[PDB]
Design a protein around this ligand. Structure first.
Ligand code: HEM
Ligand code: HEM
Lengths: 361, 362
């Protein structure tokens, strides 16, 4: 019930997709390069403990009565829950500490896209920690404590709780459904396809930024779903939008969910057709997103949707082109991008002496 | 992953074991046609029946006539019942309508003002409530979603709260959960098996004076925010002084085990347990059933966080009202703030597949 924290790559990218998610973006408040590398090493030290199910530092209790506990404790006696912890570096981070010439080109700023309604507050970030586990309380505990450890050095800019499937009740040999009611993930890069990952996800040494070798580039979008609207369309409209039938997830005309799609059979603005790599010169992404529901608004409407997360070897040749191709997507009627960030995701923590970002600092 | 049984003398989601996730929604009625509303009630009851047993509402999520939108939104498809439960309540404001005034029970008292109170009126009150709990949040969401969709026009959603993890227990035999302050929360609650405790402190009785409420129970909801920043920089001793138990095991102060009976005069005069305990309140006993929430950041660089506190009792005036009044000197106050309020009468359980929600009031 745990995922090895060390390795060539960071866990949480090609490893099994866990049930829950706490994504937080942080802004750096120090300009001390030393202070920062110090926190990086501290943060790594605590990541090792949390991914193995231990409290941070000297535990949640049993210390000097007069000190505050090292660990806030609400993970006591829960299991590691396959917790993974992925840290990434926003572009604005490279304006500090004199790293401006270390910024990888593939960490390209997103264009503004048609329809964009980017909420500036829930956008961007100097760095991020993706926290995945099957128990949401573990994930949150992780973020809470990491915030606490870097307090005075970093602050939480925005935070996003999500969920996918509940592995306690659904088969992993079965495709999860998003809040629009369709199966989601059918044509994705899978953690087993090492050659796919090497070609489309991991950064190569010869890519141009040696410190990113084995890292990846992450694109995040908070995507609101106009639910009450979508719910009023007919089954045929809905099935028309993506190009798959709702109940079985089959590409129009075909019988099974995993039949290869025949795209001409799909309406020319169908999602699957416009996202498909054959539509995009080969561009193929690893999608690792979670649905979200934050509650209601002032208008009565469900505040729900897809927290879309994509990993790629180069933002320019991965997300950018595919997002460009969805200008005309039929889905646009029912969604709206309302927050966004990119991050270079450094390679793994190689052993117990390594630390997060060592290749950079 | 089983199903919880929907029919009964009482509604599920109360004495039932606490499921992991919560999705709570408060509804306001927008129609004045009482037949229209009674029709709603019957149709919601029929929907709930399908939903708690793992089925699509209506004709299903697909395979209907293509030109028409599907009966079920379809995102529970392939998911188990997941111990889903649907509990409905009636807010005080509902009796102003449909000539239901004279039936509003005495035990649905409005709450007085409490010092500290900072209540957002947008996220307070409500004509009625659906409490949906489930071990899968997708299942929880799906139920609220489809109930609202069916009710389009006759009701709208005033506000909602998702609880991402439980901080209550109705089963003292399974481990007690921790709230976001780090302490076990649930130890001395009321258990779903103590049937006589349930009757004396939770179920409404005929003799209690409003006959349609027999087999029911009244519900208080407080949205309580936690100043975790403040709390996270207090000493371990201060934290333990605040409640009167220790953080590691959750034992009353001095004693060695979580379930040992607390000895109240070893605790500080203002410790939370010492003040909340029934002996300090004439025996007032609550069935706590709350969940934790976190809603983004607070915009000041910290995580928003708190506890959606839910309490069930036979009479608000002899339950929440005295305990909360006694908490006016609780040491815990310096770390929390009440920011949302709302009470509800919860009717008795649907007896069978002919009965319907509120059939006893209507
Ligand atoms: C609410 C927003 C979105 C929804 C509901 C959605 C839904 C879906 C669905 C149902 C499928 C078919 C099954 C599958 O996952 O293979 C799909 C495929 C796909 N989507 Fe999305 N998507 C959304 C946003 C995006 C974005 C922002 C991108 C890229 C920038 C994207 C790219 C893709 C790709 C690459 C595929 C695989 C296409 C294939 O090879 O068949 N989607 N999506
Ligand atoms: C964030 C808000 C609150 C927190 C964190 C909290 C925390 C706790 C904790 C840790 C316990 C340990 C004992 C147990 O669960 O058996 C407890 C007990 C209790 N709390 Fe609270 N509490 C909160 C608010 C309230 C409120 C608002 C009430 C009533 C209005 C209340 C009434 C009680 C009662 C009656 C007990 C157990 C009494 C007994 O049988 O000993 N609590 N609470």
């Amino acid at each position: 019930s745990a995922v090895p924290f060390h390795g060539a790559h960071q866990a949480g990218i090609a490893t099994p997709v866990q049930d829950r998610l706490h994504f937080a973006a942080f802004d750096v408040t120090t300009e001390d390069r030393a202070a920062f590398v110090a926190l990086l090493k501290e943060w790594t030290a605590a990541a090792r403990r949390l991914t193995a199910g231990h409290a941070v530092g000297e535990g949640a209790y049993g210390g000097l009565p007069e000190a505050p506990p090292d660990d806030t404790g609400e993970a006591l006696g829960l299991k590691p829950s396959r917790l993974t912890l992925t840290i990434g570096f926003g572009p604005s981070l490279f304006t500090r500490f004199g790293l401006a010439d270390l910024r990888p080109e593939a960490l390209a700023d997103l264009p503004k896209f048609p329809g964009d309604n980017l909420d500036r507050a829930r956008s961007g970030g100097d760095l991020c920690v993706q926290a995945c586990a099957d128990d949401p309380q573990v994930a949150v505990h992780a973020i809470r404590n990491l915030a606490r450890i870097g307090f005075g050095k970093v602050v939480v800019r925005w935070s996003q709780l999500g969920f996918g499937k509940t592995s306690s009740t659904t088969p992993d040999k079965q495709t999860p459904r998003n809040l629009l009611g369709f199966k989601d993930g059918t044509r994705n890069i899978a953690g087993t396809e090492k050659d796919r990952l090497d070609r489309f996800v991991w950064a190569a040494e010869k890519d141009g930024t040696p410190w990113m070798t084995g890292g990846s580039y992450l694109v995040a979008r908070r995507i609101r779903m106009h639910i009450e609207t979508w719910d009023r369309a007919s089954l045929q409209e809905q099935e028309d939008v993506f190009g798959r039938d709702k109940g079985e997830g089959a590409p129009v005309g075909k019988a099974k969910e995993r039949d290869e799609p025949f795209l001409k059979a799909m309406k020319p603005d169908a999602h699957v057709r416009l996202a498909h790599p054959d539509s995009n010169g080969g561009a193929t992404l690893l999608r690792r997103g979670y649905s979200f529901t934050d509650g209601t608004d002032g208008l009565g409407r469900l505040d729900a949707g897809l927290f879309f997360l994509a990993y790629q070897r180069d933002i320019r040749t991965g997300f950018v082109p595919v997002q460009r191709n969805l200008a005309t997507d039929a889905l646009n009627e029912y969604i709206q991008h309302v927050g966004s960030a990119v991050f270079a995701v450094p390679p793994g923590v190689r052993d117990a002496d390594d630390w997060w970002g060592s290749t950079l600092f």
